[PDB]
Every structure is written in C-alpha cells, then in structure tokens.
Amino acid sequence: KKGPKVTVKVYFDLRIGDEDVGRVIFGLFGKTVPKTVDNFVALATGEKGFGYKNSKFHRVIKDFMIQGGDFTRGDGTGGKSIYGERFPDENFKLKHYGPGWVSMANAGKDTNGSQFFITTVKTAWLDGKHVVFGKVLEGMEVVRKVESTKTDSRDKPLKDVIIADCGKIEVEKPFAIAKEAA
C-alpha cells in the first residue's frame, strides 16, 4: 500500500489538572499541504509570541473529538494565524482514517485559523469540508485518559487541560506511514 511522507515532528506535552501524563509525539505531512504545516510549526515554537504555550482545551465531547485551542480567548471564537486571520483552505488530499488524525477546525469556507482537533473514531460525517494536516504517531493512552474526564453541559471539562510544553523535533529523512489508524 501507499501513504504520504512526514517532514517535521512536535512533542506536545499535556497536563490534566494538577497531574502530568506524558508526551504525544506528533507527525506532520510537509509535502502535501505546504502552508498549514508551516502555520502549526511556526506557531508551536513561540517564534513571534502568540504561542500555544498555556492554552485551553474547551470542547471535550465523549466520542467525536477533543478539539481546543485559542491563546486570545479561552473558549470563544478566539484565533490568530500568522497569515492574517483567514488563510484559504489549500487541498483536501487526505480523508480522516479512524482514530488519531489531526485536522483544522474552520468556521465555513475560507475561514480557517488556529484550532486543531484530534479525531477519536472514524469521522466521515465531515470529509472534504475540513483539511487534515497530520497524524499522531505515539501515546494513544494519553488521549484516552484526556478523553475520559468528567464533562459539563457545555462540553467544557470540569477540571482544566493545560498544555504545559511544546517545541520542535526534526527528522532528517522523510519516511512513510500507513493509512488506516494509529
């Protein structure tokens, strides 16, 4: 079988409430969607200053997504990319294949921003309306633990999901990944 390549890695570190769980080593395609992958990478390094450092996971729905990210506000329509406020969707080349894929949460057509969502099951309801730009490659148990916290009526976790660290990990030779899950 066939699959896309990878170019860069990020080592997102979550902390549930007052506890630390692990290290979700990500994986980002850098030759199929060149732009959004630059958005995420440059934004996750604290380059300009609008970093993901000390962000909030607002929506945690039990079995569809774990989406959350905003440094301006804490849960609202807060968002600020580097290309302005709205960078056009570029190519819907891949489709969500089961657990553990990363795609951009838009608000319509040509209204992207900085709000990433990790999928937990196959989610074909949305397909071709959202651009996917990365696959996780480690630490599913961390997502499993962060997905099982007591939620509220408005999907906000009762406790807080603080992202306490990030950065860059480089790979010097693009390898390949499969196309089913994990």
Partner: peptide, 12 residues
C-alpha cells in the same frame, strides 16, 4: 515551483 506561494485570500 510551489503553487502555494501564489495564493492569497480576498481581503488581502
């Protein structure tokens, strides 16, 4: 070369 450098949104 890279087509992405030639694309920009309408308000720009």
């Amino acid at each position: 070369g890279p087509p992405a450098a030639h694309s920009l949104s309408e308000e720009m």
